[PDB]
Symmetry: C3
């Protein structure tokens, strides 16, 4: 007996959908769900999705509340849909996937991933749920995560972090490090060797290596000299150039963080979704330097140093492809006279 009122009962009494019986009275108005508590309406859910309000409400209530892959990972791996769960996209306040399997009668294309409608879709499977490894083995297209080994299957070690109710974290009381597996057209695919982005934010930025501690603490010329970085244009790429009307460089999140602790600046997130490379319309409050499309990636600084130091500096311009978060990211590399001029994720 699935219903709007029953979903609301679960939210009010359990914090989310938990399969409990019961009903509470509900009002729908203005894309918002309310319920009566002692004779006044209390807001339970504001629909920010493109789905109907009561449908979105049910999907949100049925969201996965265990650590799950960040949406950008699932996207980069080509995931279309999840088996018997909802991956809630907290950056968009919306379901990560349009359709569902065994979740909601308005969005379900199937009750079970073994139905033939699911065959051409890349289904996400969670080895922590009973039977789902087996369902991946029988699926034509899919992505599987597990905490441990699956007999015969060659694993890919995923990122250290995962998302728990919209909080991205490296778990200590829970496990957030998964093995990853993928199948295309019935055939297991070798996932590529890859870097992972670090999913940090500007206000709460915290370093994760001695080099990153050195970066935030040392002045620019000291850091560059210590890590033998002359000729790699870190003054431009990482620290940023605020001297001209067009803001120069500034493509590593750690660089933004250092600048932010001194003087604030405005980041307009004009495509607000989770992705490996983010684009911001940036305006520096101190100088007035700005840039309409500033591509930013949060790599561990050691990894960015490793990447840029392995490049051939004898070419004037080169497209460098780097595998990050399981996807190929193109960088523009500009050199002159054997040193880097600039190096940025290509637009």
């Amino acid at each position: 007996h699935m219903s709007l009122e029953n979903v609301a009962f679960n939210v009010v009494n359990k914090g989310h959908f938990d399969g409990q019986q019961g009903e509470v009275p509900v009002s729908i108005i203005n894309n918002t769900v309310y319920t009566k508590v002692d004779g006044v309406d209390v807001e339970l859910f504001e629909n920010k999705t493109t789905l109907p309000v009561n449908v979105a409400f049910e999907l949100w209530a049925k969201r996965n509340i265990k650590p799950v892959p960040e949406v950008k990972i699932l996207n980069n791996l080509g995931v279309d849909i999840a088996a018997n769960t909802v991956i809630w996209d907290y950056k968009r306040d919306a379901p990560a996937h349009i359709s569902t399997i065994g979740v909601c009668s308005m969005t379900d294309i199937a009750k079970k991933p073994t139905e033939t409608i699911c065959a051409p879709l890349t289904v996400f499977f969670d080895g922590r749920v009973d039977g789902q490894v087996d369902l991946f083995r029988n699926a034509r297209n899919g992505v599987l995560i597990t905490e441990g080994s699956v007999k015969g299957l060659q694993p890919s070690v995923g990122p250290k972090q995962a998302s728990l109710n919209g909080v991205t974290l490296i778990g200590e009381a829970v496990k957030t490090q998964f093995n990853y597996y993928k199948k295309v057209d019935g055939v297991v695919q070798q996932l590529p060797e890859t870097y992972f982005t670090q999913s940090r934010n500007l206000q709460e930025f915290k370093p994760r290596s001695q080099m990153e501690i050195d970066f935030l603490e040392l002045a620019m010329d000291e850091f560059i000299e210590r890590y033998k970085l002359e000729g790699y244009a870190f003054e431009h790429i990482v620290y940023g150039d605020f001297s001209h009307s067009q803001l120069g460089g500034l493509h590593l999140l750690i660089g933004l963080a250092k600048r932010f602790k001194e003087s604030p600046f405005e980041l307009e997130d004009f495509i607000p979704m989770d992705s490996t490379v983010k684009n911001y319309f940036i305006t520096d409050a101190q100088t007035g330097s700005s840039k309409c499309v500033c591509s930013v990636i949060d790599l561990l600084l050691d990894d960015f140093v490793e990447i840029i130091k392995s490049q051939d500096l004898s070419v004037v311009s080169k497209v460098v492809k780097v595998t990050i978060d399981y996807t190929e990211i193109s960088f523009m590399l500009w050199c002159k006279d054997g040193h880097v001029e600039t190096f940025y994720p290509k637009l």
Copy 2:
């Protein structure tokens, strides 16, 4: 001559409704009220209520702008409606009560509380307004607040704090401590002896006793040893246990505050209203420990210590009823071998 345009005149010129004559031009669109200032529309009010936009606008403009009881107190006392004022619920951005008396022609059930429609309703009366004590004496059901004594009536001393335009505060330039009185079916009721919650928030938390100062400053084992608290499971109840996937304990706001000053965590307020006991879906950003329904109460720590120390520890499980904010709050008490295992507000 009451009107939308006149209400808007008062808001623009006086900050709220003040009974002044005048009109300004108004536009209504998208549940929002606008007015023209020099030929551009300026937003005056966004309707977040379940009432029609212009009705909600008028009630908000007519909100009481003196210190008033917090909504949770009025709710716990059974208040249905206020006499000739609007108690605005700043936690819901909505009127605390569905109907009104002598306020608004769309929501009024009566012009005066003496009309017979009001008799079965518990009417809130404010002794600071002329004639309202007398109206309480003649009302069949009601709650009265005063700053001083009412001849013959046995008072109940209320909380130290009250709400002034949505700010909860202990007044120094104004009085926020009221006497409380209540009548049911024409008969004055003795209000019970009660604790009061402290209405503090996580970011702005400030202690209010030497014990609370000691709690935030001392380490756990020092605080417990100083206040002779061994065997009362404060390590679980108050400090919180973040070692397992399910977050243990953590039911006193002061405990959350201590944890917050060290590492942040996410509180999902999934029933956003004022109440004596709040329920949060909590996720700890550092460990990944979480809990779907974490009941939290902001008692003075001395009061919580007094409560828990008066309990009988010879039973395995017991429902303990405590009067807080004039309402009976049920606690689950779990003991083993003469010590507390856990003690939480019952769900």
Copy 3:
């Protein structure tokens, strides 16, 4: 080939409208513009204006992204409309002007400012755009800004600060100081000698003279004695009086800033637009002192001292007119026995 889809293409790929060819798929629902990125809808724009959603979207995308006069300056100068650009009002999330010239086919009253419909309107011209000085010379009503001199025209030096994508700043990598010129009925008008407000905010307040540094650092009686301010009621006007239920004085932003660094307070911005004088419904969290209409101006403290010290203190009450941001601001001056009682922007 102007279109909704083309505007969205520019936003997605360039951060704003940039005249590039291309289309992306778009969805409109709930006053919001979305676009598909890999098969999920992503929000590009939430319409907060009184215009239709797709019209507002286009105006916002075509906003001027160079430093521009703050909206309050343009308003005070009587600007009705801009020539071939959009001044976006970041305080209202809406176009500063109702109509446009050569911007958008839904809001255009003309393609060029020389069309006769524009003659009775005060058109804003930007000397940094080719041909616009000449268009001002031929316009019947207008306001012109330039970075340098215009032959024959007597300039007015404007404020040091301007707005860049909603950030108000004194430019170091860009120029934000303009000359101002104005024409009424075909005749250049002498702009008056004027003070300028400083456009600072409460949380990020930073002093801009030795006197202002002294104000934030020194105690009240020391500051008053140092700058020979006895008898000018700074204890009331600038520092604020929180002892009675009605909050006294507190009309200089710098005074609010000092108070805020010690104990927080609530400012209800009940007419949320840019203006030289702002009105707030203020509630002091510490004392409960409040005031429905508290007029606040952010003058440099030196300027406020210069203003108040030039006043005649032999009258009981006087309306003092001061030119600020090119507009006449009326102050009420109350004196008794040769000293200031109060001095505030008149309501």
